[PDB]
Amino acid sequence: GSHSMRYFYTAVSRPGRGEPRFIAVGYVDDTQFVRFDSDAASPRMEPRAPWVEQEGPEYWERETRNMKEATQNFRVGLNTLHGYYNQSEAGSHTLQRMYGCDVGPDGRLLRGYRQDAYDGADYIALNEDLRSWTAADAAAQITRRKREEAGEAEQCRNYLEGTCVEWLLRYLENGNETLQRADAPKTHVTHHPISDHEVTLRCWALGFYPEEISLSWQRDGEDVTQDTEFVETRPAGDRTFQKWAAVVVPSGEEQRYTCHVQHEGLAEPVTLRW
């Protein structure tokens, strides 16, 4: 269907304990394929998915170069912004960036994004029209100016429309046997008696991809209220995901309850029972 490639930058200052550490991860869809950590003994961009390993030495030399240059730049960002806000020399401060591009089923650019964040809050983002900036505050507007006068937006649009999309398609191509494929959840129900009067019914979905999923409990064919105990969808470590949903039920009325699961990898919604 539709696909995305995204990069996540993070710079964290550590006053009186070294220079700010810089970390980056690349994703295509729900699949990380790339990483960089400036505290690594030999800071290099590194493969976290099979279909990028094939890339040539020129590629990696290039990516590592950007990462090292990004750590330098973001370190300035931290120092520059720290001044704007006139903050104490006390504790740590953060500068994040997320950028990338979405391509539709046809394979054309749906939209580009390039957001920045200071201390975990929106700071300045490139607008969906890839031409103007949105400043969140007094400081960000100073930054806004600098970028307008320098023509930063145009350069960003170049990469987002062109380079970003090209790479994305290439990766989709080179890693099609896993990127294009959806894995169905393996579902089951567990039975955890609370007391002689109540029991917990927990509905598991395991080993699925991508992470988007829907679990739900019904009684007699109608929804539950109230209510289902979820857990946030969590990685298994093997590139698939996990989720469960539980309900307390009258000890003896287990039959009234069915679990309902919907996921891309299922030809059709599934219905489980105890």
Binding site: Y7, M67, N73, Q155
Partner: peptide, 12 residues
């Protein structure tokens, strides 16, 4: 492929 940075797009 990550975004190359230049003196035009590295402002703060």
């Amino acid at each position: 492929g990550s975004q190359k940075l230049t003196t035009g797009n590295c402002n703060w």
